Design a protein around this nucleic acid. Structure first.
Ligand SMILES: [Mg+2]
Ligand SMILES: [Mg+2]
Ligand SMILES: [Mg+2]
Ligand SMILES: [Mg+2]
Ligand SMILES: [Mg+2]
Ligand SMILES: [Mg+2]
Ligand SMILES: [Mg+2]
Ligand SMILES: [Mg+2]
Ligand SMILES: [Mg+2]
Ligand SMILES: [Mg+2]
Ligand SMILES: [Mg+2]
Ligand SMILES: [Mg+2]
Ligand SMILES: [Mg+2]
Ligand SMILES: [Mg+2]
Ligand SMILES: [Mg+2]
Ligand SMILES: [Mg+2]
Ligand SMILES: [Zn+2]
Ligand SMILES: [Zn+2]
Lengths: 25, 136, 80, 91, 101, 97, 103, 212
RNA sequence: CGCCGCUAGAGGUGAAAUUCUUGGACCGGCGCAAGACGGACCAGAGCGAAAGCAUUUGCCAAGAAUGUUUUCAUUAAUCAAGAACGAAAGUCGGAGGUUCGAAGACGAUCAGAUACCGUCGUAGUUCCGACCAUAAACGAUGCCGACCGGCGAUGCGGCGGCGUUAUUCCCAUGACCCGCCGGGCAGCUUCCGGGAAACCAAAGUCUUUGGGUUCCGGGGGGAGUAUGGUUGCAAAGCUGAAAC
């Protein structure tokens, strides 16, 4: 696994957790 | 028919466009103006196989057919213009031109001066292959 | 063992202006014998501005980067 | 004192009709309510009349301008093309 | 008249037929493009604001420039009140009720 | 580690070089990195020049030359047999005969 | 054109502090009737009636006319004052040569 | 069907004072109702290279012709433009030179206005060690102004007959070569292209004047 | 796209097909329209603080370097906080849409392909207004100042050379050739020394250890992640720990 795609999948997980916080503020 | 000229000693000229690509070879006979097509036989008109229409064996058959039709219609000499896919593709001609020039010079068809009028763009417009392009 | 105390004058001429010891200026003051009536004018060598005689109102030195090129061949002297 | 930080002139509306719509209306409200330099008398008295019409206070020379500015940039391009086609090859 | 002006001239308030006092391109901020003059068979192509290229006569007239008031549809109406005043100024064209409703 | 002092291309003073497309695989490569040569051929292969010389109208008064800027990239140039590999002491060399 | 424009602005800078000049249309009327004015400067966007009247008075009273290609705001900037001016009359230059070079 | 048995042959007459007036023979379908034979033949052009027109000059400097009309089974052509060959244009382009370009519009004496180009390459001197041979670009701007200036006072005061008679020995290129050596020794300055963009009138009387 | 001539195939491949065609494809000759793009000339060349910058001409201000017996008189170097630009991609308005082309749709290979090959094609790629401030933003090498080898070169200024060649002819710049000087992109050799070596005239003047100054590293993961603060319309950016 590339460091680039590890960073982008952790970025997608960060966006998912941000949407979870916006879903339950 | 007799056509253009009787009492030989003066040649009747025609422009022979040869468009060679990596997939097909065009031989085309026009007058000195540029509109009146005299004969036009491609590679696929002489070769049944689609992978062998770019072969130099297709060029011999197409050029002999065109040289036969030109001797039937009565024109003597040819000014050969040579061109390829030069807009964005490879500017070098394909494998058909090397055989087509020999097959025109073999059976009649006295050749005048040959000029390689190839369409060369100014400043390298956008290539079809993309970023990293052709692979294997 | 290079002799830095008493070097060669040709070597110190071929060196740069400020690298040498005394740091003497490479410029000079030249005497132009203007052919107008009689006047001889002292003028700096690397003349930045134009040089006009007050008597004949002719151009003596053209402004040129480096040193000033001259007019018709007036003489010049070196006084140091 | 800087009372408002983002709404500007649009704060007369309030909480209604969207942030992007208020942001897009902000620049053209500033454009229609700003005074412009009169090209004839040199003053800043170009007040907006009805839509498309500008009016200078001094010397009363009413001019037909853009709908929201004094000169549309497309109209300035049209004026440049008109003078180019005028002095190009004598009509 | 459009036969006098050269090609590419940006004009407005032009005419379909010669002598009807201005029909085409009359809305605010619109223009036509004059091209393709012909000495024989006196015609002229004009590019209209819809993008259509119409062949018209060469004797009809047109004022040079664009119509003032361009960019009028840049601002949103932003409420029902300005739409009510706009359509009350224009004509009763606003009983806009949904046909499914 | 470093394989080359020049790091492939010849960019030393400037910071950006315009990419020029390749010929075989058509990849945009900067021109100081891409293999840029200039092929000079006869317009007819030398085994077929004699046939046109025998069947020519003029008495050998025309001899055209075909000049093409050839522009390969180093990813396909090794496959295209131009830029073959060398030794560590052989990478310091110049224009081959 | 840089030589001509920077020359005109430098001559105005020198007349600004060296010589004596008058300002405004009503004062240039008295100066062009008394004949003290030698050169007048009109703005680009001055109105045509005032422009033709000042040109008529100058060509009756043997006075040069210079049309300054510029708005009256930058003409006031060129004469060096914060307001705007459309009509100048250089009645006495200090060390300049506006009334010598151009006419 | 055999349409070439029905097709007709017209021979092409070049205009005067090249050396001769022979070009070749072209195909005409025939005249049939609306399609007159003098319709497309007026629009047909030609593109011919030398050693047959200019009485044994160089093989490059091609010529672009266009047929004005036909007169007694002989279609008479007229000058349309002038080009050079691809191998000559791509030749004399060395990797260590400086290629100076120029182009200018100019009107002739009559109602013909044309657009002509100019190409120049640098020249290494005899016994020169420095292989670069570049310029300071101020002489390049000055020589672009110079080559734009020379073509004005040739082609403005001369119409087609005199400018073709000046392009017979390439006197424009030799004049630029003579007036060029004070700046730089530039190598084989040619014009490389000129084409006609505006044509005023048919002018059969001026064509008879071109015949003489 | 408009016409003209001929004709059964033309594109696309390792090989075929998806695509268009007697409703004329493709090919040649002429004209028009659209927008993108500045090759060859173009180089271990130049400029710019970097990102970056290549058709001609005009205008607008700017700057390096050089030549200065010209001017002021320590006005200087690096920088917490703060600020100006900042490739490409992405977001919000207005104009169109040439080519390419994320996604998407098929046609092929493959046991399996949605990928590598091909055909069509949206967003985008263009320009004008704003936002985002990121890269292998590289020379993986902070800035200023001195010293410590040579050589052949290149570009930019200055100087010298009854040397060579160009105008019409003394008068002056033009081009070549030889040498020197100032900073610059550079190359070869070397035991001058460093370093683990590759390699480096800097990555040297470091146990014989100290010229000034700014920022960061303390095994690998967790992790540039979580929680806070802050900027942004958003994607996200900056600061950024602990358990194990
Ligand atoms: Mg990757
Ligand atoms: Mg809208
Ligand atoms: Mg509705
Ligand atoms: Mg409703
Ligand atoms: Mg490796
Ligand atoms: Mg970079
Ligand atoms: Mg169909
Ligand atoms: Mg075609
Ligand atoms: Mg960007
Ligand atoms: Mg939107
Ligand atoms: Mg496509
Ligand atoms: Mg996929
Ligand atoms: Mg989106
Ligand atoms: Mg970073
Ligand atoms: Mg730093
Ligand atoms: Mg020099
Ligand atoms: Zn007013
Ligand atoms: Zn390649």
């Amino acid at each position: 696994m590339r460091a680039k795609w590890r960073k982008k999948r952790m970025r997608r997980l960060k966006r998912k957790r941000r949407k979870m916080r916006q879903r339950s503020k | 028919s007799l056509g253009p000229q009787v009492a030989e000693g003066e040649n009747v000229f025609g422009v022979c466009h040869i468009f060679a690509s990596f997939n097909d070879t065009f031989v085309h006979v026009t007058d000195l103006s540029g509109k009146e097509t005299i004969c036009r036989v491609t590679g696929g008109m002489k070769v049944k196989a689609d992978r062998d229409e770019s072969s130099p064996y297709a060029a011999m058959l197409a050029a002999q057919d065109v040289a036969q039709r030109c001797k039937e219609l009565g024109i003597t000499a040819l000014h050969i213009k040579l061109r390829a896919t030069g807009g964005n593709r490879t500017k070098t001609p394909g494998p058909g031109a090397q055989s087509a020039l020999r097959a025109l010079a073999r059976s009649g068809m006295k050749i005048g001066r040959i000029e390689d009028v190839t369409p060369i763009p100014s400043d390298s417009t956008r290539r079809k292959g993309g970023r990293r392009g052709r692979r294997l | 063992a290079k002799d830095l105390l008493h070097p060669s004058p040709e070597e110190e001429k071929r060196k740069h202006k400020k690298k040498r010891l005394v740091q003497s200026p490479n410029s000079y003051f030249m005497d132009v014998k203007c052919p107008g009536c009689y006047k001889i004018t002292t003028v700096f060598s690397h003349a930045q501005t134009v040089v006009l005689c007050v008597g004949c109102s002719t151009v003596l030195c053209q402004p040129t980067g480096g040193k000033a090129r001259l007019t018709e061949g007036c003489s010049f002297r070196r006084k140091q | 004192a800087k009372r408002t930080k983002k709404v500007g002139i649009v704060g007369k509306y309030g909480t209604r009709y969207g942030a992007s719509l208020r942001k897009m209306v902000k620049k053209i409200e500033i454009s229609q309510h700003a005074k412009y330099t009169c090209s004839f008398c040199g003053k800043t008295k170009m007040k907006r009349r009805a839509v498309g019409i500008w009016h200078c206070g001094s010397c009363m020379k009413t001019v037909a301008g853009g709908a929201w500015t004094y000169n549309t940039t497309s109209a300035v391009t049209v004026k440049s093309a008109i003078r180019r086609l005028k002095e190009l090859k004598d009509q | 008249p459009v036969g006098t002006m050269p090609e590419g001239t940006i004009v407005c308030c032009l005419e379909e037929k010669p002598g009807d006092r201005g029909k085409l391109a009359r809305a605010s901020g619109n223009y036509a493009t004059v091209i393709s003059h012909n000495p024989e068979t006196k015609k002229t192509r004009v590019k209209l604001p819809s993008g259509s290229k119409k062949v018209i006569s060469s004797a009809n007239r047109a004022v040079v420039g664009v119509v003032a008031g361009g960019g009028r549809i840049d601002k949103p109406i932003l409420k029902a009140g300005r739409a009510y005043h706009k359509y009350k100024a224009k004509r009763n064209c606003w009983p806009r009720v949904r046909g499914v409703a | 580690t470093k394989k080359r002092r020049n790091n492939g291309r010849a960019k030393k003073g400037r910071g950006h070089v315009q990419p020029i497309r390749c010929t075989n695989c058509a990849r945009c490569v900067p021109k100081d990195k891409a293999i840029k040569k200039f092929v000079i051929r006869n317009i007819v292969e030398a085994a077929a020049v004699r046939d046109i010389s025998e069947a020519s109208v003029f008495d050998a008064y025309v001899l055209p030359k075909l000049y093409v800027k050839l522009h390969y990239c180093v990813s396909c140039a090794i496959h295209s047999k131009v830029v073959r590999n060398r030794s560590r002491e052989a990478r310091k060399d110049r224009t081959p005969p | 054109t840089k030589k001509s424009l920077e020359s005109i602005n430098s001559r105005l800078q020198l007349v600004m502090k060296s010589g004596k000049y008058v300002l405004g249309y009503k004062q240039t009327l008295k100066m062009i009737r008394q004949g003290k004015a030698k050169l007048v400067i009109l703005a680009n966007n001055c109105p045509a009636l005032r422009k033709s009247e000042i040109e008529y008075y100058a060509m009756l009273a043997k006075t040069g006319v210079h049309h300054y290609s510029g708005n009256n705001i930058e003409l006031g900037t060129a004469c060096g004052k914060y307001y705007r001016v459309c009509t100048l009359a250089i009645i006495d230059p200090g060390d300049s040569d506006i009334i010598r070079s151009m006419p | 069907v055999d349409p070439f048995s029905k097709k007709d042959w017209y021979d092409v007459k070049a205009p005067a004072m090249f050396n001769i007036r022979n070009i070749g023979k072209t195909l005409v379908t025939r005249t049939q109702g609306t399609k007159i034979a003098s319709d497309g033949l007026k629009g047909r052009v030609f593109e011919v290279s030398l050693a047959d027109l200019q009485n044994d000059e160089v093989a490059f400097r091609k010529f672009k012709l266009i047929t004005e009309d036909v007169q007694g089974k002989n279609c008479l052509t007229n000058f349309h433009g002038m080009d050079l060959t691809r191998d000559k244009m791509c030749s004399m382009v060395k990797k260590w030179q400086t290629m100076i370009e120029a182009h200018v519009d100019v009107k002739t004496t009559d109602g013909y206005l044309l657009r002509l180009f100019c190409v120049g390459f640098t020249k290494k001197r005899n016994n020169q060690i420095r292989k670069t041979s570049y310029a300071q670009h101020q002489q390049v701007r000055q020589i672009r102004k110079k080559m734009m200036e020379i073509m004005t006072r040739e082609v403005q005061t001369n119409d087609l007959k005199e400018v073709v008679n000046k392009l017979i020995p390439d006197s424009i290129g030799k004049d630029i070569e003579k007036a060029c050596q004070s700046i730089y020794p530039l190598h084989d300055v040619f014009v490389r292209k000129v084409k006609m963009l505006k044509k005023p009138k048919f002018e059969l009387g001026k064509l008879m004047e071109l015949h003489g």
